Amino acid sequence: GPNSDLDVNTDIYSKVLVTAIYLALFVVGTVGNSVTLFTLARKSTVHYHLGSLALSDLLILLLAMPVELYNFIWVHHPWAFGDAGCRGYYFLRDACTYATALNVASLSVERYLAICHPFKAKTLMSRSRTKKFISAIWLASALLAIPMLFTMGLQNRSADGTHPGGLVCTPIVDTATVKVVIQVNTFMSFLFPMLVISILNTVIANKLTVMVPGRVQALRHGVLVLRAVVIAFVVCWLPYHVRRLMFCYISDEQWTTFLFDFYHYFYMLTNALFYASSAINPILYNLVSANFRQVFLSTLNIFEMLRIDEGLRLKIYKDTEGYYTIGIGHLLTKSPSLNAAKSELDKAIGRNTNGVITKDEAEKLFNQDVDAAVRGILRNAKLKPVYDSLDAVRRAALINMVFQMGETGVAGFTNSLRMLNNKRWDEAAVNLAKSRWYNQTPNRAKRVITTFRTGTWDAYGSGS
């Protein structure tokens, strides 16, 4: 036959398996991302990025999966969508690919700022700049896909010069360009976003762990999700860009019937995983938020520690030393004047409180104070290297001290600090337990000392 070599040899099982899979991903991903859009619409800046991500993934399924399933899984030749179809389909495939790539990446950069740079995030961001940001990543996505309009194209590969059943869509340009094009795709669609996602997520994950049983269980799944997101990206997208690079980097000299046959099976695997990304993303990225169980499934360390040690009160009290305090250990003033406090409390939040506040207002204060303590530690020579060397749990204990006594108070524990720095847990504990601190607040200090000497939550059985 004149096209007989363009025949792809693959098990009919295999073709029936991948099809069943493909369509399974297709409903779950079309529904999930639709329902996601339906859910997000009826609801700071993450909600738009999640929606942008939802679209980009919905489009991968609707634009890429149908033609691939006809023309790449079953009927390999001929290409039944003409030359412009060939150019339009790889363009649109690539565009959505970049959109998802740039969305996932942006979404991580967005949550990096929210949690590690909340000052900027507040003043130097809004829902205007967000939509300016999102416009840019379809604008850019569409831009980056343009090469595909010129490198792809129809071609008659049949042994005879031209026979209608041997037309194929394929890179119809020299390998010096096609290798270059495919390695820009790989770099911008995978590596750049790999570095971004893998780094920032892990940085966010670590910071979030130190920040954060029932009341904070949401945030602890969020951490696991943050790490899951990276594994998900790698596994679903790495084989896809291997196959695209293998396509162009193996020379016609080295190609063999076996390799030819391998590739087309590898195609079934790689692309099935690729479509998985779009299907799971809506579920993975929306897990952390409340209403997950609800919305999709209808369609069928420092906070805890201080919450215990400082407690929570809504009226003004006098702390251990006798100073007017409110909420989660927020010292209002050292004055003995009960009015002077009320004045400073109204100033604090910005309204005539009369010495009483709401839980939201207490938790807003807390975060400002913890921010303050952590900046305190990171900006201090005597505290940064100690903190840097400690694990998530012991870091929190160091913050408990700074929250209680201040940055320059804790800098006074010159040797107890050195000992923690050098993992001499027992010696630190004994020397810490001989302090004025320990005398004033034995219960709290002993829990904090236990935390330093164990690295566990043994002290905080009362946590909720």
């Binding site: 070599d5 363009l6 792809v8 790449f72 390999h76 030749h77 790889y90 792809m152 071609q155 590969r157 194929v168 869509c169 394929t170 890179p171 695209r244 396509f247 193996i250 016609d252 190609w255 019937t257 030819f260 590739y263 087309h264 195609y267």
Partner: peptide, 6 residues
């Protein structure tokens, strides 16, 4: 002989 599909 090599793949034409990408």
């Amino acid at each position: 002989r090599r793949p034409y599909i990408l």
